[PDB]
Amino acid sequence: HMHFTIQREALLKPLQLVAGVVETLPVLSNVLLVVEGQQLSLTGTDLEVELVGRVVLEDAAEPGEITVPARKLMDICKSLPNDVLIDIRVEEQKLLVKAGRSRFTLSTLPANDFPGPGSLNFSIAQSKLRRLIDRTSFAMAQQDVRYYLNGMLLEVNGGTLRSVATDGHRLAMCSLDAQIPSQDRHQVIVPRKGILELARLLTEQDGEVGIVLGQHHIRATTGEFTFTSKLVDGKFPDYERVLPRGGDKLVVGDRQQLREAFSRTAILSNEKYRGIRLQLSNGLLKIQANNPEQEEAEEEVQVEYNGGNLEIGFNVSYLLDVLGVIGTEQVRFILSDSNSSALVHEADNDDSAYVVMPMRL
Amino acid sequence: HHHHHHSSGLVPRGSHMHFTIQREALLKPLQLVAGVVETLPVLSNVLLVVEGQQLSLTGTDLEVELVGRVVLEDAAEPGEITVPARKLMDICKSLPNDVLIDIRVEEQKLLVKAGRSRFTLSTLPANDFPTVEEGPGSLNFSIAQSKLRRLIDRTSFAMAQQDVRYYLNGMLLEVNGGTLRSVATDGHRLAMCSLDAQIPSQDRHQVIVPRKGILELARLLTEQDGEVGIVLGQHHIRATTGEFTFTSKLVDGKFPDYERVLPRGGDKLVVGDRQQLREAFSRTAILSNEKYRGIRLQLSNGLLKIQANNPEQEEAEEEVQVEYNGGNLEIGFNVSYLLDVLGVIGTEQVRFILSDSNSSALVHEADNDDSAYVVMPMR
Ligand code: NA
C-alpha cells in the first residue's frame, strides 16, 4: 500500500546519511522506510549505531513500512537527473521507483525484521561538539585489550563539557564551557566508530544539537536527524593522574615549521619504529632521524626557549597527530626529562591538552 | 709501449658531482622519473648525471627508461651517482617552496642541504646502473604531443590486462601511408584512432607498446603545443621532447589482423545524445548482474529502451529518444564496454552502426570516422 512522491535532492540528503551507517543478517544491509502522515523516516543501523533521517512530504502519501537495499536506493537516487520528482510505491514485496523516463524494481525485506530515560539533557552548538571530537579523536585506541579505550570519554563537570581520548601511549583532551546543570559528575564512553560518525554528522556551521545522555546510550538530535549510539560499558581511566605535572621547560615554536620539520626528518627514520630524536638547547630545537641504511636527516628549528639542555625521543606519528589539531600559529610544549611525557597546548589557551609518552633513545 | 687500464678499473673513480637547484626546477623531472621506479637495489635508485650545465635524472624498471633533463643556472661540478629515487623525491617535495637545494657527493653519500635542513642518503655508483642497448631505428618521425596523446587516450581503455595472449596487453601503433594509428583490444572489444601525420614512410610499420609503458607515455605528453620525436625500433620505441627521453621495450609478438574484425555490413544507424545515453546506461547498470554487467537494448522507431536484470529479480528500465528508423532490434551488451566507449566520445552526439543481434556494434563520434569502437554483443 505504501506510496509517496519526493524530489531527488529532498530524498538524497537523509538517504546518503543513513546509507553511510549501513554495512550476516540480510535486513541489516537495508534502509527502513516509514511513511506516517506527511512524514518519511529513513532508518539505518549496524547494531552499534542507529541513524534516523526525517523528511516532510509535500504531496499526498499512503502510509506503510518496508526495508530496501540502502546502497542500491542511494545509488539510484544519486544517479537520477537533478530536481526530478521520484514516485515510490510498494507492490507485492517489491519497491517500485519511477522518475522521468526511468523505472526501478527493488527487492524488499519486511519492516518487522528491522530492529531508556535520559540522566542528563542539554543543547550545544554543533560546531562546539564537533570541535571536542575533532580535537581529540586521533588519540583513541583501536582494538586494544583495554576495551574502554576504543572510544571517547564525554564528561560533564560544573558547566564544562570535556572530551578525552587515549591509547595508553598518548592522550588528547578538550574542554569547553557549556553551562549544563549537572550537580554530580557524569561520564559516558562513546565507541570509536560511533563518535567518528557523530563528528561527520555535525555540519551545521551555526546550528544546534540536542544531547541526551542515557545509561547505556547517547542520543544526538538536530531536527532532521536522530543519531543513537550504544555506550562502552566501562570506567574510563583516572586520566587526571596521567597528566604530567613536573614540567619545568616551556618551548614556544611555530606549529607549521615544527610539523614540516618532524615530517621531513621522519623520511630517514627507521620504517619499523618511526622514532625521531629532539635535542633542545637555548633558542634551538635540533630534530634528527636515522635508519638501518646509515641514512640521516637533521633539521634545526629556532624556538622560544631559555633553559638547560634536553635530549628526548618520540614516535614521530604521535607528534604529527598533535600538531595536526593545533589551531594557533604557535604551539607550546611543556617538557621535563628524557623519560617523562611532553604536555602540548595551543598558543593562547589551556582548553585543549595533549600528552605524548617519550621513546627510549 | 703498453699502458694501464681495460675499462679503467674494477672500481669506478669517486664522484665529486655538485650542483644547486631551486626546489621546483628539481621536482618537475624528479617526480616523473621517480614515478617509473618500482631485489636489485640499484633499480630503486635514480641516476643523477651532471655534464656541463645539464642535469639528467634517469629511472628504470627494466621495461621502460625515463630520462628527465634540467638546465642548471648556477656553477656545477660534473659527476654521476645513483641515490634512492622515492627518498630523494619525498625530501625535495617536503622542502619549503622556492628553496635553493644544494646537492653534493661526499665519499659514498649524497649530501642534500636546504636552509637549516640536512639529509645524508646512501648511494650506488653510476657504473652499477642498467644501460639500454637499443638496436637501430627502423623509422623516425616527429609529431605534435597533443596528437600522439589523443591516439593513446582515445583507445587505452580497450587494452587487455594480464591476458595469456601477451600481445594484447598493450597498444598497437601503426604507420600505414602517412597515417599514424593506435589500436587496442582485449579480444572482446576494440578501440582505434587514426591521424594523418604525414610520416616519411610508404610501408606498413607496426609496434606493440606494453600497457604500462604506453599509459606512462600518455601522462608525459603534457606540452599542449609541443612536439615529440619518435623512433620505432625492432625491439624498442623512443620518444624525445627536450625535457624528457622515454624508452620502452616492445611486446615481442604480432598484433591481430584487426582489419578482419571491423564490422562492415551495418544497415542500422542510431544517433543519440552521448551524455544522456551514458547516464541512462550507468543508471540501469545498478541493477545489472555484478559479473556479466549485461544490459538489454530494445530499439524501435525514434526510441531506445534499456533494460537490466540481476539474479535477485530486480529490474531497471529507461527509455531514451534517439534518431533511429531501423527495424525493431533487440541486442545485449556488457554495460561497462558501452560506458568505456561513451567516456572517450568528444562530440555531444554519438553514432552506433548495427546490423543484427549477434553482430558487433560499430561506434563513432558525431562528425568524423577518425575514432572507431567495436563492441561484441552478448547472447
Ligand atoms: Na547532451
* Of the options 3.60.15.10, 3.40.50.1860, 3.10.150.10, 3.10.20.90, the CATH number for the domain spanning A1-117: 3.10.150.10
CA distances, B8 to each of B4, B11, B13, B79 (Å):
8, 8, 9, 16
Q: Is the alpha carbon torsion for B39, B41, B44, B49 positive or negative?
A: negative
The experimental technique behind this entry is X-ray
CATH 3.10.150.10-classified regions of chain A = 1-117, 118-242, 243-361
CB contact (8 A) between residue A103 and residue B287: no
* Of the options 1.10.10.10, 3.10.150.10, 3.30.70.100, 3.40.50.2300, the CATH number for the domain spanning B131-263: 3.10.150.10
CA-to-CA distance for A325 and A140, rounded, in angstroms?
14
CATH 3.10.150.10-classified regions of chain B = 16-130, 131-263, 264-379
Distance of CA B246 to the CA centre of its chain: 11
> Class of B16-130 per CATH?
alpha beta
What is the CATH number that goes with domain A243-361?
3.10.150.10
DSSP B224: T
Using CB atoms, which residue from B87, B116, B314 is nearest to A106?
B314
Resolution at which this structure was determined, Å: 1.8
Identify whether the C-beta of residue B35 lies closer than 8 Å to the C-beta of residue B27.
no
Residue environment code for A30-61, b if the CB has 16+ CB neighbours within 10 A, otherwise e: bbbbbbeeeebbbbbbeeebbbbbebeeeeeb
Assigned CATH topology for domain B264-379: DNA Polymerase III; Chain A, domain 2 (3.10.150)
CA distances, B227 to each of A83, A204, B161, B173 (Å):
46, 52, 30, 18
The secondary structure element, H or E, covering residue A82 is: none
Q: Which residues of A touch B91 (CB under 8 A)?
A: 264, 267
- Adjacent-strand bridge partners of B330: B298
- A residues 269..298 contacting B (CB < 8 A): 293-298
Give me the residue label for grid cell 637549516: B116
Q: Which of B173, B169, B168 is nearest to B151 (CA)?
A: B173
CA-to-CA distance for A180 and A123, rounded, in angstroms?
9
* Nearest chain B Cα distance for residue A361, angstroms: 20
Residue B310: phi and psi, rounded to 5, are -125, 170
CB contact (8 A) between residue B287 and residue A72: yes
Residue environment code for A222-257, b if the CB has 16+ CB neighbours within 10 A, otherwise e: beebbbbbbbbeeebbebeeeebeeeebebebbbeb
The C-alpha angle B101, B34, B220, rounded to 5 degrees, equals 105
> Class of A118-242 per CATH?
alpha beta
**Gyration radius (Cα) of chain B, Å:** 26
* Nearest chain B Cα distance for residue A222, angstroms: 32
CA-to-CA distance for B343 and B262, rounded, in angstroms?
20
Give the DSSP per-residue string, B64-77.
EEEEEEEE--S--B
